[PDB]
Symmetry: none
Subunit: 383 residues, 4 copies
């Protein structure tokens, strides 16, 4: 059976049906949003129904007696008319054809395509120790009814509308070349004797939930002892619209038992799996969704297209392996550190249906840690 | 002259006298309810007379005491005995002492205090297009007689009782929050330029009937014209017991005559006065009383005390200034959203200040005309 | 008739530097090179090398009491020639060098350091109390210094054997510009659907420091409202574009008429403004071409970005605009203010198309500079 | 036993006794000078004996003197009660007998602490200092036209006013610096922290250094100095910056790597063979002489009446491969201020041992 996600307008006049909550960006192209709108023909007499796709970067959170301060930048806007029908969305998909057969004669198709110049779903709420405000890139599918005179007077009533926050999720391209090992080495001279650190990953692209085998090779020709080896996956977040906020957070860690004594060498392989489920604390890190939602993951690596200014991605997300070595003194000791970049995203994608309808409303997590509840949807009693 | 509000029981046995219909909550403290009960000593022979103060949230019906009411939650209950006389039977307040002198020997004082954890008078009856039901927080002063039977069942006849629906009205505290200020900017799709809106209010607390000067600064760096600047006072109502009803309603609105052309800025002050008398439709909005009553106003902002669960307020009322900008060729072309920002403020009654001659009057509130 | 030559001696008297000017002209097409000489005491430079460097650097940050120390430096250009022993590093001579060598004798060696085309001009500011942002600037340092055999190897080039001059790179207009359009704009402010028309026009686009700017203002009032007040300002806009995105906008000239434009009437008025540092006691919070304490210091010229140069390597962007504010009567205990900008450029005039007097390279202090934070004392102390 | 410092006038008529050579300034207040004067009653018949406290700045071998404070009390003939203020005075009067008179001279809050320097050969600038003189002297009159102050009837002690720490200290010193070298896309980042804002003379200073080298160049050397900065602010604007401690890390920082390291420095006069050209709290020849403590300027007091400003800073210098001569002619360095002073102070008839005031030579 195919799970179809539905949401009804407060006034029951407009219901939107979608095939998925999450649309795949696989670099080469992005999955379009094909769905249908069921109208109550009594409540849309003399009305037009449209569906818009909006991608917007936003910045700012409501604080108690702190100056209200928000920024919004629309990165994409598109709109088709769905009722009365005029085939604005062009030729149909199989999904639309089947949904129209299953739902009956008041069901009209819409298709909204994504262009190639957009980021994927990225948002964060700051942790207490972070300066910077809540920011994110939202993707809104909105079905709404207008009257003759309603667009003229900036009154498109909220009770006749229904908005879905879909995710644009980063998957790896269906064709990519075979994978170079991601490796580097450093020589740290200490009294002109080298401490050599090599760090090697099996490959450059890992999938969310995939173990990352980090091989660490310490050749210690110095008089000093490596007392401690820490290996982290760090997420680096650069906000590149409105405010140049910087976050760097550990999303996986192993701190080895190993010492490397003078005039000796040690090779060690640690497996790390960078996962949002690794910390109770879901604030201060780039997510692909809300802290409170169960289906929310770490944000994928930003993929900037040739000729696209990085600033229109809104939030840059990158991942790195950090290796920190604690080297003995005496009476106090030094730490050297190095990074190896890698990219984290979802796997390569794949190549008359029976339908089960379900609320487009993501399940909450039992335990999300501390978060700030955002502004409640203002689609309440407004007349 | 001091106006004293009286109501007599159907059976004439019990009369309650109150100094006011409305008791002041000024955050720091709440005015107690000091009054007296006049008994007919013939009709209360062998009887006990009490006065109760009840605060209750109700949902589904207009009063707390209605047949098959969907939901009642008691927020506070207190009761004192007035007859037979308790101890000294002496007055606590000057008002009681004077009323007892004016009314004679069958007059007994009562004092019922309010605690600090209660909401103020809030109720709404829905408008036709609203889905939720009537709900409210009522404050009942009830004087009633009990008597014994031979079968060991005490009786509280309705004919020996008298109930007054008093208001608990929110007056301002000693202090207020910082000057409310909001800054919002939008970059439209295919624009390189921001539309900037700054909003400030003169202060954080306004009084019912007080003009709110909303100062608006539009910096329009875009190619587009701001065709309209609308300033609203929105009342936000959250029912937080029984049913999660949500109302946002315009209780005042002003449309600037000025447009803001491309590559220009406009600073302007619009004055709004959120008032129940402004709104033909008195349903679908949080009031401090019944629609039919003349003395009824907009509900004051809820003030939640530290450590008190918001749910025992029953109905949360807040106010905000909404400034909405209509931008030429935007809606339908480059967005399907509003261009708007909100600034919270609080609306309540003024701060309070720091042998009398009596005129008696039926407690019943005057109807509107 | 005399040429004034600027000299400075090293603390140890081993090296003296002579320059033709304190200020070198950027006229967009080309930049005046720095031609001077170094007089050495041949006793004190026995077995030594003497070099002269030209450094252009953007710097950010000021010394604050109990506030975390936080500095950024970016070198935008570095060049160095050897001046002693002579090797003709600076190439063939100028007339000035030849004459100075004749006047000063046999221990006098020439240097020539050229400027490239991709640099900003002298721009710096110290913030005013109400400004957030720290001290920042673009400095041009000419430094003559002596090294021993082993001195560059060990990062010890002794300060007592060195001498640094902070020269200015001053923006002049180019010699042969095409004829100039008027800088003009007009706005229609609808008020109850009746137009208030404001036209603002300058005689040309480029004005010289000290040149009167004739601002013509034309108010056509077809509204029911009265223009109560007209303010005309020259505003300096400063954008820091390295390290921190600081923003300054300051009035550097102003005329406010009380004289009114009633309903159904129109008024043209021509005001002269002269944007000058001399207009305010307060020299902080504005882009200068030099230190607050120095008398020869002026307002910074308009930044001139060359095609294909990233604006960020200019360090501090300085622009000028005419601001017109109209106070328009309302319905009322207050009225509305509309404001508009017309950009123009401010720089020094086009350039023109010996007997020597020596003088300390040390700019004269101003009698009254207002409040400033004195910078860290020059580092020419007993080391 | 309590060591009491004494000095007798040439003519043996006046002996001054002090509890200490060094009086504590702990910012909140300054220890008063409580002592006694023993007179030979035969040699002071018809005479008056006074004790003065003088603070003066001097410059030259005298090129310039500026008096910063003067106070004087009468000790003989006895003033009023003639009773002790302090337990020390009361006990000294009991131990020394009936010709012993107490004096108390207070310090105000607006004075510097003991600071002086003699220049090194490489320095221009002359000897200068702030001296504190306790002087007991006799006046007398053989003739109505004048009183006379014979030098043979006087005795002067050069006391130190030593800076001890207050109740509080500033926030943890931290500096961050970054450099983009000409033609490098990539920053060299240096973070420096100290454990705290006030260190005591002889106390190890742990300087934590974090070098983030995102450049293609190697940091070949990390040098950490304690620099003493001296500004003479009366008569002549002499400026001294001198290294009073230095430590060179063994570690290089290669391209595209970071190193966090703590170097421990102890700024001490005993580190420097050369004791000239640096602000001391006393004479070079004296054993008890230390580095001058940080000047502490009080709100509302003009820094010029401190005479000599002394400050301390940590300098961290990074030597970068293929830089000096090729891409810069400048040093790569940052500074972190801190304050250096003596520890916070603490809060049956005592047993006394008398000793010549004169400080022991090295």
């Amino acid at each position: 059976n195919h799970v179809i996600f539905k949401k009804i307008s407060r006034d029951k006049s407009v219901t939107i049906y979608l095939g998925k909550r999450d649309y795949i960006d696989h670099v080469e192209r992005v999955e379009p949003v094909d769905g249908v709108v069921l109208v109550d023909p009594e409540l849309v007499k003399g009305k037009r129904v449209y569906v818009s796709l909006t991608c917007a970067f936003r910045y700012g959170q409501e604080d108690i007696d702190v100056m209200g301060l928000s920024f919004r930048r629309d990165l994409y806007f598109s709109q088709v008319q769905v009722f009365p029908p005029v085939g604005a969305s062009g030729a149909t998909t199989r999904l639309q054809e089947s949904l129209i057969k299953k739902l009956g004669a008041n069901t009209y198709p819409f298709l909204l395509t994504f262009p190639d110049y957009l980021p994927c779903s990225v948002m964060l709420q700051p942790a207490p120790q972070d300066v910077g405000k809540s920011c994110g890139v939202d993707f809104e599918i909105k079905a709404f009814a207008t009257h003759s005179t309603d667009v003229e007077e900036d009154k498109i009533p909220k009770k006749s509308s229904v908005r879905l926050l879909i995710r644009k999720v980063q998957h790896a391209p269906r064709d990519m070349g075979p994978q170079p090992r991601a490796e580097a080495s450093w020589q740290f001279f200490m009294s002109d004797k080298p401490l050599r650190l090599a760090v090697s990953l099996s490959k450059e692209i890992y999938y969310h939930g995939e173990p990352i085998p980090v091989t660490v090779a310490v050749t210690n020709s110095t008089e000093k002892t490596v007392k401690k080896i820490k290996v982290l996956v760090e997420q680096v977040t650069n906000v590149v619209l409105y405010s140049s906020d910087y976050y760097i957070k550990t999303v996986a860690a192993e701190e080895a038992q190993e010492k490397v004594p003078p005039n000796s060498s040690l090779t060690k392989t640690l497996t790390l799996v960078p996962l949002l489920a690794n910390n109770r604390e879901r604030r201060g890190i780039a997510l692909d969704g809300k802290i409170k939602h169960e289906d929310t993951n770490l944000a994928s690596s930003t993929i900037i297209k040739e000729g696209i200014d990085k600033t229109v991605m809104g939030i840059l997300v990158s991942y790195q392996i950090k290796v920190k070595l604690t080297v003995s003194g005496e009476l106090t000791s030094s730490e050297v550190a190095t990074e190896v970049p890698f990219r984290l995203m979802h796997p390569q994608p794949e190549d008359d249906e029976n339908f089960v309808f379900e609320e487009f409303a993501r399940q909450n997590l039992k335990d999300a840690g501390e978060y700030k509840e955002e502004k409640t949807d203002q689609e309440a009693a407004m007349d």
